[PDB]
Structure formats: C-alpha cells, structure tokens
Amino acid sequence: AQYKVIDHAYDVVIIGAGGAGLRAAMGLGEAGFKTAVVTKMFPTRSHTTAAQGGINAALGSMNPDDWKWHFYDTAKGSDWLGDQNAMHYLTRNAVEAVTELENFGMPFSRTPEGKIYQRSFGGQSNNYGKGGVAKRTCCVADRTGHSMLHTLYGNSLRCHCTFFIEYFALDLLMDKGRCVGVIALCLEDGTIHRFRSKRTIVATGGYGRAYFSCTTAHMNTGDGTALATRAGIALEDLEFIQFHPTGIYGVGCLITEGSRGEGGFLVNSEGERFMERYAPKAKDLASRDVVSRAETIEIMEGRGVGPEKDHIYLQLHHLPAEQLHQRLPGISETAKIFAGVDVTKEPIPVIPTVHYNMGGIPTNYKAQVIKYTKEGGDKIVPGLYACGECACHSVHGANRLGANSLLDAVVFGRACSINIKEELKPDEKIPELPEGAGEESIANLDAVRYANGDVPTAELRLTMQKTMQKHAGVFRRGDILAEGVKKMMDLSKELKRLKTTDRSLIWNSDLTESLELQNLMLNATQTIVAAENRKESRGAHARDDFPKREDEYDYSKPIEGQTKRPFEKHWRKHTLTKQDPRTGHITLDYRPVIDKTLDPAEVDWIPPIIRSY
Amino acid sequence: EKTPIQVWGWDYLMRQRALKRPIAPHLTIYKPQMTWMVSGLHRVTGCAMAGTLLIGGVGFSVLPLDFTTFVEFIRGLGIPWVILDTFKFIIAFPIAFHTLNGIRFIGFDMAKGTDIPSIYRGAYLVLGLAALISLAVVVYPRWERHKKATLPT
Amino acid sequence: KRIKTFEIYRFNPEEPGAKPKLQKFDVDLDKCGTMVLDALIKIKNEVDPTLTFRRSCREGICGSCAMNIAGENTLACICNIDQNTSKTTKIYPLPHMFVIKDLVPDMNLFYAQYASIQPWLQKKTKINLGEKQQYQSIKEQEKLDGLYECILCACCSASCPSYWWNADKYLGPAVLMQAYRWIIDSRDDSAAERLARMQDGFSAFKCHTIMNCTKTCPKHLNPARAIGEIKMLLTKMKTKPAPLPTPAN
Amino acid sequence: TSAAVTGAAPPQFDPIAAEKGFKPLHSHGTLFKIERYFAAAMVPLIPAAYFIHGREMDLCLALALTLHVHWGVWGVVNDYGRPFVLGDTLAAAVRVGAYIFTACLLAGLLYFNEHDVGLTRAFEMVWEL
Numbered sequence A: 001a002q003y004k005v006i007d008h009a010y011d012v013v014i015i016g017a018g019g020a021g022l023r024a025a026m027g028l029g030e031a032g033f034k035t036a037v038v039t040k041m042f043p044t045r046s047h048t049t050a051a052q053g054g055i056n057a058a059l060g061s062m063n064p065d066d067w068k069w070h071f072y073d074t075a076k077g078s079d080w081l082g083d084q085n086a087m088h089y090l091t092r093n094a095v096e097a098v099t100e101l102e103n104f105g106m107p108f109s110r111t112p113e114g115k116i117y118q119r120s121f122g123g124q125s126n127n128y129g130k131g132g133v134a135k136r137t138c139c140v141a142d143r144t145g146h147s148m149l150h151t152l153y154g155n156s157l158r159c160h161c162t163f164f165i166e167y168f169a170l171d172l173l174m175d176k177g178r179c180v181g182v183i184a185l186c187l188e189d190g191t192i193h194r195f196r197s198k199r200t201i202v203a204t205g206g207y208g209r210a211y212f213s214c215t216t217a218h219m220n221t222g223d224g225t226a227l228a229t230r231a232g233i234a235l236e237d238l239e240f241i242q243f244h245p246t247g248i249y250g251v252g253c254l255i256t257e258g259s260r261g262e263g264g265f266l267v268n269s270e271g272e273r274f275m276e277r278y279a280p281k282a283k284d285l286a287s288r289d290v291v292s293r294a295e296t297i298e299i300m301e302g303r304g305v306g307p308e309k310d311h312i313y314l315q316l317h318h319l320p321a322e323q324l325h326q327r328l329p330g331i332s333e334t335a336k337i338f339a340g341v342d343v344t345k346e347p348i349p350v351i352p353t354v355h356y357n358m359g360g361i362p363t364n365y366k367a368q369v370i371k372y373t374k375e376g377g378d379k380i381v382p383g384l385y386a387c388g389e390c391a392c393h394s395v396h397g398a399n400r401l402g403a404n405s406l407l408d409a410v411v412f413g414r415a416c417s418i419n420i421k422e423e424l425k426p427d428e429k430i431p432e433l434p435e436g437a438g439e440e441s442i443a444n445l446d447a448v449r450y451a452n453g454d455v456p457t458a459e460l461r462l463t464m465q466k467t468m469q470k471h472a473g474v475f476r477r478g479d480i481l482a483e484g485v486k487k488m489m490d491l492s493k494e495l496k497r498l499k500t501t502d503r504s505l506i507w508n509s510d511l512t513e514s515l516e517l518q519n520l521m522l523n524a525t526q527t528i529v530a531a532e533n534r535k536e537s538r539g540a541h542a543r544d545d546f547p548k549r550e551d552e553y554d555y556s557k558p559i560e561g562q563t564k565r566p567f568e569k570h571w572r573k574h575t576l577t578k579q580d581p582r583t584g585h586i587t588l589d590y591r592p593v594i595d596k597t598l599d600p601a602e603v604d605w606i607p608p609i610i611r612s613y
Numbered sequence B: 001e002k003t004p005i006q007v008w009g010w011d012y013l014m015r016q017r018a019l020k021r022p023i024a025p026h027l028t029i030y031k032p033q034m035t036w037m038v039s040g041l042h043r044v045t046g047c048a049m050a051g052t053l054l055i056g057g058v059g060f061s062v063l064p065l066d067f068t069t070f071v072e073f074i075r076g077l078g079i080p081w082v083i084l085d086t087f088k089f090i091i092a093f094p095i096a097f098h099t100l101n102g103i104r105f106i107g108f109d110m111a112k113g114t115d116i117p118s119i120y121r122g123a124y125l126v127l128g129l130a131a132l133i134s135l136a137v138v139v140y141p142r143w144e145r146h147k148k149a150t151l152p153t
Numbered sequence C: 001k002r003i004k005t006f007e008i009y010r011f012n013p014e015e016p017g018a019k020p021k022l023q024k025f026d027v028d029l030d031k032c033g034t035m036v037l038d039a040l041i042k043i044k045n046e047v048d049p050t051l052t053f054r055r056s057c058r059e060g061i062c063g064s065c066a067m068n069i070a071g072e073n074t075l076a077c078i079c080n081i082d083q084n085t086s087k088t089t090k091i092y093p094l095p096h097m098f099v100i101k102d103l104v105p106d107m108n109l110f111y112a113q114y115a116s117i118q119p120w121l122q123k124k125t126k127i128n129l130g131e132k133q134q135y136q137s138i139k140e141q142e143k144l145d146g147l148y149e150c151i152l153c154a155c156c157s158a159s160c161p162s163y164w165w166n167a168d169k170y171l172g173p174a175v176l177m178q179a180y181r182w183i184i185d186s187r188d189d190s191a192a193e194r195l196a197r198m199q200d201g202f203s204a205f206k207c208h209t210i211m212n213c214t215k216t217c218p219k220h221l222n223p224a225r226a227i228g229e230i231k232m233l234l235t236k237m238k239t240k241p242a243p244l245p246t247p248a249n
Numbered sequence D: 001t002s003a004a005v006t007g008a009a010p011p012q013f014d015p016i017a018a019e020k021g022f023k024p025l026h027s028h029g030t031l032f033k034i035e036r037y038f039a040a041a042m043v044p045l046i047p048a049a050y051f052i053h054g055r056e057m058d059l060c061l062a063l064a065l066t067l068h069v070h071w072g073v074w075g076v077v078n079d080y081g082r083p084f085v086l087g088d089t090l091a092a093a094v095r096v097g098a099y100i101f102t103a104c105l106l107a108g109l110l111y112f113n114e115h116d117v118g119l120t121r122a123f124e125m126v127w128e129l
C-alpha cells in the first residue's frame, strides 16, 4: 500500500518513557532543550512500574554507611566484568539521585527520625566486604518501581517535553555513522513519523519475552537493541541474563528480593534452610546468580517442592503480621491472586525466572553509544546515547545487583542530560535528514503487514521462547548450547514464512507484535551464540562444562610469581555480537574490561578476587 | 467560565466527535449495583416529587376540576383498601427514602462512611428503614379504621 | 471438556462506516490460563489476530488492560475467568470512552486532566536540588497510603455516571483522588492554589456521591473518601501543617 | 516514498503554560456548603409536617421545598442538558428552563395553598380513602 510520513525536528529525542527515559526527558527539559519523547505505551505502563524492592543509595538512614562500600559491593556482584569507572559514577551519584527523588515528590517509607527507610537486599555489605549485612536499599514499601516511575512521569509534565505516546520505534536515523533521529509508527492513526534531532537516546528497556518464562512485561521485546543492531552497532554481554531467584512458579510474577532482606527465607522439600549451605555468610541474601543456581540444584537433586517436586518455597509466614503488611503489602496481594497463598500462614511457591538483562548497547561512562575495534580503541557514535536496561555501560558486569537497576536508570538518565547540556552548543543546528531517510524501515512494515506466509507470528515467537529456555537456561553446556544455536538460526529462517492477518494501520496489535518478534529474534540469536562460545562460568553465565572463572591471572593463589595469560586465552572480556539483520549472521569479538576508576584519587580500583558469598 | 482544562476538554470532545469514534456502551452494559441504583433512586424520587409538586400546583390552577372534587372523582370509583393503601405507600416512600438517603449522601460529602461495607450497610439500612416508615404510616391508620369499624366497645 | 464463550465488543475504524458489533468466541478452559487476559491472548493467538486490546505487566500493576468484564470495570490480567460455563461472559471497553479500535479507548482526556493537577512537588522556598531529604514523619507519610497506590487504570472514572455526562468539565474520581494525594502530602506547599484550581461548580463538586468509583477499583483504593475529603477543604475543614524538622534532620 | 509534509506537536495539555493568564478565583465552595446545611435544616421539618399541620406549615413546605428543588433541578439539568448533545443554544435554554421550573413551582404551590386545601390537607384527604 501507501503511507503518510510526518517530519519533526527536536534538539534531543528519547526512545523510552521508563525510569531512565523520563529522567533524561526531564533533565534536558529543565536545562532547556526541545525534547521529544517517543514510547510504544503510556509512560506509566512501562516496566519500571513493576519494580519492587527499592533503590540503593548510601543515605545511611538506617545505620552509618559509606558510598564506597556500595561501589565495593557493586564491583563484586559484577564478577569483575563491570567497568569500575561506570560503577564508580553510579555509586557516587546514587546518594544525590535518590535524594532528588525524595525532593521530586517520591514518597519513600519513613524512619522515626523521618528520613528515608532502608531495607537489606540481595548481596550487599558494610566495610568493603568485611563488615555486616547492608541496609542501603531505599523504598516506597513494596512498590518502588511503580511510585518512582509515577513521580518521574508527573515531574516530566513540569518541563515541556512533547510526548509521542503509543508510537512504535522502527529504526534509528543514520547518516554515515551519525545519529540524526528516529522513525516510529503512530498506532492511533497509521501515520509514520520521522523525527530529526541532534541527539537520540535509546532507553527502551530489556528483552525478557525472549524466554518462554520471565518476570518482565509483555512489552519487553528489546526493540532498542534491535534498533542498535539494525543501525550497525554491535551489542555487548548479551549472554548474561539475570535469573531472579523468586518468580511465582506457575505464572512467574515476581516476589521481591525485599521479602528476603526483611526476614524471609528459602525452604526445600526437607524443610531445610538450604541457603545456609550454599552461602554460609550471606545465607538467603546471596547474589541472585548464586541464590538461583542454589535453588536449581536442590531441584535437580530431588529436594524440589510441590506436586511435581520442581519449585521451592519462599517462606515469610514466621514474620509479624504488621511488618508483612507495612513492608511487603503488594506481594501479599499478588501471592494470593496468582498462587492462592496467604503469606502469614503458608509459603509462596517460587522458582528462578528470567528477569533482567545486564547486556545491551555498549556505552562509555558518559552513556554515549560505542562501536569497538581491536586496533583503534573504541569509537564514540555521534548523536547517540543509550541508558537504562537496554544499555551496557556495564555497571552490572555479569550479574546485576538487587536495587541497582532503578539506580542505573535514574543516574545514567540524569547523566544523559548533564552530558548533553555540557556539550550541545546552541550553534550546531538540527541535522537535516538524508534522501531516502528511513525508507527500508517502512518497507519492512509493509511486507510484515501484508505478510502472507504459513507460520503465524504467534507460533514463531513461542518456539523461540520455548527453545531459548531449554538451551540458554540457568545452567548451560556446550553440546546443548551448540545444539541450540542451530535451532535458533533455523528460526531466523522461518521469519520468511511469517504470516500475519490484521492488515490495518490504525492500531495493529498483530503487526506491532510481529515487528517485536523480529526484534526479539535478533536479541535472542545473539544472546544464545555468545552464551555458547563463552567457555567459562562467571556471574549468571554457568557452563557445567567450564565451571571455572577464567581470568588473566588465577586469583585463587597469591598472584606474586605468575604470568599474565594473554587476552585471547582468558575470558575477562565483554562479548560483542555484530549481526546482519538481512541474513541473521553473527560474528563475535571481545572488548577489554575497564579497570580504572574515575578518580584514582577519589576511590581505589578493586582488583579481581574469588567470588564467594 | 471554564478552567484551562475544561476548555482543552471541550476541544477534545469536538476532536473525538470529528473522528466519528463510537462511545463505549455504559448504562446498558454496566452491572446494576447498590451503588448507582440507590443514587439512581435518589435522583428519581427527588425529581418525581418535584414533578408532582409542579403538575400538582400549576395543574390545579390552570384547570377547573379542583382537588376536593378530585379526591372523590376517585373515591366514587370503589377500589380495595390494599390497592388504595399501596398507592399511599408509593406516595409515602419517595419521601421516606429521599430524606433518609439525603442524610446518607451528606455524610458521604463529609467523607463519612465511604468504605464498601459502610456503603452497603447504609444502602440497606436507609433503604429498608424508609420502607418500614412508609409501611408504618400507611398500615397504622388503616389499623384504627378497622379497630373502630368493628371495635370492642 | 469445558468450553467458555466470550462476547467481545468489536470495531474497525478502517472499514467504511462500520458499527460496533458483538463477537462470540469459544475458549477451551483447560488450555487457557486462569485470568481473562489469558483467554484474551489465547483467542488472538489461535482464532483471530485482529482482536485488539492493551496489555503489559500481566500482574495488574501497569493499568493497561483495564476494561469492562461482566458489567464491571476491572483489570483483565487479574480478573478470574467465571469458571461456570452455562454463563456467557462479555468484555466491553471502559464505559463512555471514545473507542480507537476494539477494546482500546482513546485515553488522552483522562491523561490531560491528570496533567492539569500538576502532579509534582512544589515548595514556597526553592530547594537546592539533591542536597538533603525533606522531613516527613512516618505518621505524615501514611496519609498517602491508599493514595500513591493508584495505577491510573481509569476504571473508577469510567464507572462514574457524572464523568460519563461531563468528562470534559468534571475531573472524575481518578484525577481527584490524585489531586488529594498532593494536597495532603505534608511536604507540598500548594494546598491553597491546588484547591483553587478546582473551586468551580464542576471540576470537583459534580461528584454526585454515586459510589461506583470505590466499589469498582481493582486496587481496593477509595477515591470517593478522597473526593469527599476534597469537598471539606473547599468549604470548612483544614490541611494540617508540617511538624517542623527536629534539628539533626 | 519519504517525500511528505511536516506535522505539528500532538494535542497535549501543558499545565504551566495554560496556567498563565487564567488565575481566576470564583468559588462554588461557599454555595455547596449552604445547600447541604439547608438540606440538613430540612431534616427535622419533614417529620414535623407529618404531625403539625394547617396553613402555616403548608407555606414553609412550599417555601423551603421550592428553594431546595431549585438548587436540585439545576444540577440534574447541568447533567442531562449538556451542550455536547443538545448544541450550544438549545442547552442554554435548558439552563433557563430551570428557573422557569423553580418559578412556576412556587406560583403553583402558592396558588394551591391559597385557593385549594393546602399541601397538608391534601395529604390528609388522599390518606382518608
């Protein structure tokens, strides 16, 4: 058919209306740029609003705390795949960022002295690891993502950003390696909108829906990563899918790690607190990569709970009625709706669930998207920034910290506007669009929209979800993985036999979901092959066939009197997957993990150690 | 005088009218509930009385046929005391209810008794209470017009 | 094997002068999840990809999947399917909204009305942004419990006949409840000019106390109590003031 | 092709900008208060009219009922006589209709109290049959 195109011109455009997105939107807004926000749903419906346990910052409202311990705990949880400057930036500016939120309106739960309340969480500690169990996690009780997001969304109305709601992003606008805008679909009426801008910010969130089961929204299809791949950017660390310890067994709703850091624990079919075994020190407050494998073993070895002996129990019922209600009200109600459970009397049936993506579009500490060559360092991509979960500045290495993603969004969002305000001179005029501007993007829509094949979008997605789950699981092995990479790459073939039905333009659910299957595949393929070729076990990545963590040195011995293993033989490196969308062919490459902090004078880089919780 | 949103909102309506979009089904499909049917009732009673007080006053002016001659242009139509006293009920009940409920609704306006249990106790208490008082006022004076038609003395 | 039939409201804006119709779908209850959304995603995946509705979280926290199921505005995702199959269940969109297509309402008026209340935090003495937290006592903050929880799902508004007749002039339950969340947040310095924004005969006073808003709210929130609390401030009773930050804060 | 027009910002409410030259403070607050006190004042009067009858109650039933019903039909009319569905001028008529209704109400009652049996005797006589 034929399509109606609408050009706009803005200083900066943000793809995404979540935690990160909205903070970039408001920061640029307040510092006076003409800002367009593009988002496939109403901002409040974004996934951030599902978030629960809270947000880490060393307010030390509960007991004395130093921001540096949080940097410590961050660098650890990241299994030294995290870039210690990014984790530097993140954890310094946390105290401010979270205080802002309090100032913006965000109604955190309160201590008697009347400061922000904090609970304890998955995998944190006072004194550079030695001290105690940390209390850094700030929260609006049970529902912190929600309340955070709302506060941000409200606040963004005070800063004249122009909101393009339910517009679906198709591609970034590339002029010879520069980013000049976005092209999106406007669901409400059929119209196609090219946006020109000096800066784009891709802040589009994760890709859980790639797996048959996850805690994420139906709305997490990694469209942003798709937009990166598609504009010739390689994505990093895709292989590190966070498995959250406690998804409700049947549906996979998330019971927050907060319920643990408040008192609750895991139990096996012998009624044993088996987390005392897998983590003598941290117990049920070990990192999710650990706590999860811990659960997954207990299952494998017959200690599984239930009718089929295949989940475990999170138990909170021992806790006081009052505390359960004031500190975890929103899970009390979702445990009841979905798994018939009264949390004062019975345990919640739980099982690890695909949850978070440390992986994403590469970016330096400044949150500016980057391509990388072996010989010529890492090239900035002009005009492009990316932040929140779709990004990889890698503040998260190989394993995210509980309550650090609401932070990594808020902070690096803020770090987008700050970094643009700084370097966007009011001389550099809005780029013009090139001829042919985003034509092959509408050409895809058209063919996807009239797609006549004999495999319905609904079916392709399912088997990609169902396969990705069996092969790129919690524990992985090379003979299943390479098996997997095969099936997967047959699916990127099946995309040619794609059938759709709804042939309309005004609100096409069938069509957008097909665009999303396209995007999901790119995400999933790259994931699985990077997962396959990494012969080691670090953070969330667990090869049963390469159980060790392979670094330049062996950090188990004293170090003094060892040769550095050369780059190519060890694995302490980010995994870059380049893909051709047309063909679906992936090639790997690797990028060195930045170890320097931001101010060698302000804070001391933390050299790798053995990861025990 | 419309607030800036009230203005925006009208243009919104005009927009949405121009786009020919249907309006989603409402009173046809929404489930009869004690919330909106009692409110519904409070409207109707309230109006029906007012409507009578008009056609009553004005109608008995603008017309010959006055109330005294009419109060027995119908007594002369031999109709059984139940049918008659049922009509009185139907006259009495609006008044009982609308008053009773009126005190209820003012409470609401002070944010008082606004929870689903309190909504529903009142919906019933006010409702039933009013239908008692309307039965009291109609059966009792038909009690004495039998207690004295065939009286003990 | 047990078969539940649904009646889904349908409309194609793309078709020349098409009218809303009512479509019947059969769903094998033993090959479907427990909630309505699950039937809804089933019948679009297997029978008819043209069936259109909004959805995200699948745990009833985003608000997207709001709609009218068996007479009530509620969230699909956490609405249990009527297990009884002699009963035929009907899905309709949010009452009184302009429909975009099928179960998808034009949501914007409600969003703008939301915008109108300025749902952000203002103070009289401008603050040096990230520098210290405001003092709020625990007691003070719990004034917000029952109020921050709102998901902007719009069932309350979409159920209130006042807002059915006046969505343009009356602000409706969802928006007011929210306005109130900001006039009792002890850290906000605008009770005065907030209440002033909704002083006229319509924006707040058009609540005819009907009650639907509260009875329906899928989150068990009570916007009416709030509206009624708003009426009080617009007339008699007062907004308590801040217990001062005790030195150390 | 990508050869088409430049479009504008989508319809969107900007609560600061529209806030500018639109500051007015004309409060319906003080009116809504009274008409509830008035309804609450009427509470004892209704049961009084069941007991104490005659020619003076008849007059303040008429009086107080006229004024309550006045503030009453006015709200029911704002509701069902909205300009969206009646057009702008047929709707203004229904507003003015309201007064005519409040005013014929009294005329008609006054009359009935002055020439026929009165409200309260009217009640008696229907209750006698």
Ligand SMILES: *Cc1cc2c(cc1C)nc1c(=O)[nH]c(=O)nc-1n2C[C@H](O)[C@H](O)[C@H](O)COP(=O)(O)OP(=O)(O)OC[C@H]1O[C@@H](n2cnc3c(N)ncnc32)[C@H](O)[C@@H]1O
Pocket (backbone or CB within 6 Å): A015, A016, A017, A018, A019, A020, A021, A038, A039, A040, A041, A043, A046, A047, A048, A049, A050, A051, A052, A053, A054, A055, A144, A145, A167, A168, A169, A170, A203, A204, A205, A206, A215, A216, A217, A223, A224, A254, A355, A356, A387, A388, A389, A390, A402, A403, A404, A405, A406, A407, A409
């Ligand atoms: C899944 C999850 C994550 C989570 C959590 C609970 C759940 C169920 N609880 C957390 C917690 O208690 N503390 C914490 O630190 N993190 C927690 N998380 C992780 C975290 O909250 C989120 O994963 C993260 O905050 C996500 O925020 P982000 O801004 O990065 O991305 P988003 O909120 O998912 O929003 C994405 C936006 O992008 C727009 N979008 C997506 N695709 C497009 C296209 N195609 N075109 C236009 N716009 C697009 C979306 O519409 C959305 O606004």
Ligand code: HEM
Pocket (backbone or CB within 6 Å): B042, B043, B044, B045, B046, B047, B049, B050, B051, B053, B095, B098, B099, B102, B103, B105, B106, C208, C209, D036, D039, D040, D042, D043, D046, D065, D068, D069, D072, D073, D075, D076
């Ligand atoms: C006797 C004591 C009464 C009390 C305490 C009372 C109370 C109230 C209240 C609080 C309202 C506001 C309704 C709303 O906005 O939803 C109302 C409305 C109304 N009243 Fe009364 N009322 C009384 C008697 C009457 C009587 C006898 C009549 C009959 C003429 C009447 C006619 C009306 C009408 C027509 C409304 C229209 C508002 C609506 O339904 O939305 N009232 N009353």
Ligand SMILES: CCC/C(C)=C/CC1=C(C)C(=O)C(N)=C(OC)C1=O
Pocket (backbone or CB within 6 Å): B027, B036, B037, B038, B039, B040, B041, B043, C161, C162, C165, C208, C210, D079, D080
């Ligand atoms: C024209 C249809 C009349 C009718 C009973 C509508 C529903 C309605 C009901 C049912 C009410 O209770 C009420 N208070 C209204 O005004 C705000 C209403 O409009």
Ligand code: SF4
Pocket (backbone or CB within 6 Å): C149, C150, C151, C152, C153, C154, C155, C156, C157, C173, C174, C177, C216, C217, C218, C219, C220, C221, C223
């Ligand atoms: S008050 Fe309840 S029904 Fe209304 S938007 Fe809020 S959560 Fe939804």
Ligand code: F3S
Pocket (backbone or CB within 6 Å): C159, C160, C161, C162, C163, C172, C173, C206, C207, C208, C209, C210, C211, C212, C213, C214, C224, C227
């Ligand atoms: S239904 Fe509407 S009338 Fe008020 S009580 Fe709720 S907002």
Ligand code: FES
Pocket (backbone or CB within 6 Å): C055, C056, C057, C058, C059, C060, C061, C062, C063, C064, C065, C066, C075, C076, C077, C078
């Ligand atoms: S999908 Fe989030 S509320 Fe139904």
